[PDB]
Design a protein around this ligand. Structure first.
Ligand code: NI
Ligand code: NI
Ligand code: NI
Length: 340
């Protein structure tokens, strides 16, 4: 398959001489990012290096450190050079805000921090795709689905208008499509949603988040529970760290029994599963409950995270948002292109 893996090391050009200090992004980052700040400031390092480093923290479980670094960068870079620092801070706070167990206030507190940085970013660079996507993602995360879909639809018209103005053909943007597919599913238009998720599978079969999660949720809401489960097992196969896939595969296959999956649910919901330990009125109760909690995550198991796109938040290169042009679409993926 195609590859969206981040460069795994960084060379910082030293200021006085012309040697380069190499950093292994996966083991060389210190617990206190101030150490690099010293280096980065001292050697007059370029801004994109601050970003690349902060993204390494975030993508290796260290978002607080990622945030601490770019917040320090804000004391170094001036005026318009601060825009892309604010964009990073927007997406870092959107990632925080997706925290699995935040109370509605902590969520909104993090989303406010994102919005504040977003305002500073758009003030300098309103047409940057990183800032436009964040505007839509903020509406989504706040549940304002109608405004999100309407803002999305204005944005793609704008970009289309812009391609006439530069004599270019438009290329579908995977995250605008992903946002549309998710908004459509919120509006219960599961058929239009499913088509977009399937479009995404052929454009970028290594897209994060996995559009197969959405493929399965569309099948499920369209009552083809057999294929929903196949989409989800394909997701969990290509990436066994996908917790959302895991919980969906087991909640789906779980339609004695209520022991076999509490033990499989401890490997990687477990509350209400234990509430359901409390004429088969009962079988419809466990059935309803499994359905309710398969639908409990308003994020649909597909968190939109710009930190999964090499070059995007650290170099203003949005190329990877358009995916790949040859589709070796594997046997177990091409199945998922089918109708219900
Ligand atoms: Ni914060
Ligand atoms: Ni905070
Ligand atoms: Ni046109």
């Amino acid at each position: 398959y195609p590859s969206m893996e981040w460069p795994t090391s960084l060379d910082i050009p030293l200021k006085a001489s012309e040697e380069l200090v190499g950093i292994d992004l996966e083991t060389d980052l210190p617990d206190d990012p101030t150490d690099l700040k010293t280096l980065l400031v001292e050697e007059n390092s370029e801004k994109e290096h601050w970003l690349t480093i902060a993204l390494a923290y975030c993508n290796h479980g260290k978002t607080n450190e990622g945030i601490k670094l770019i917040e320090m960068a804000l004391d170094v870079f001036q005026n318009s050079e601060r825009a892309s620092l604010h964009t990073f801070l927007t997406w870092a706070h959107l990632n925080l805000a997706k925290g699995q167990s935040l109370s509605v206030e902590t969520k909104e507190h993090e989303l406010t921090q994102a919005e504040l940085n977003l305002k500073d970013a758009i003030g300098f660079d309103p047409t940057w795709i990183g800032n436009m996507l964040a505007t839509v993602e903020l509406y989504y995360q706040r549940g304002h689905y109608d405004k999100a879909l309407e803002t999305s639809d204005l944005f793609v018209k704008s970009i289309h208008a812009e391609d006439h103005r530069s004599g270019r053909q438009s290329k579908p943007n995977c995250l605008f499509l992903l946002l549309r597919a998710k908004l459509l599913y919120q509006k219960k238009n599961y058929m239009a949603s499913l088509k977009i998720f399937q479009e995404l599978l052929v454009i970028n079969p290594v897209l994060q988040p996995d559009p197969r999660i959405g493929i399965g949720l569309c099948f499920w809401q369209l009552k083809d529970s057999k294929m929903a489960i196949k989409s989800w097992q394909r997701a969990l196969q290509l990436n066994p760290k996908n917790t959302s896939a895991s919980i969906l595969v087991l909640l789906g296959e779980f339609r004695a029994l209520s022991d076999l999956n509490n033990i499989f649910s401890e490997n990687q919901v477990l509350l209400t599963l234990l509430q359901t330990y409390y004429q088969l009125i009962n079988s419809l109760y466990i059935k309803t409950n499994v359905t309710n909690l398969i639908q409990q995550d308003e994020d649909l198991g597909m968190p939109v995270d710009l930190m999964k796109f090499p070059g995007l938040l650290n170099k203003l290169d949005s190329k990877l948002l358009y995916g790949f042009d040859n589709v070796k679409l594997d046997k177990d993926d091409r199945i998922l292109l089918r109708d219900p």
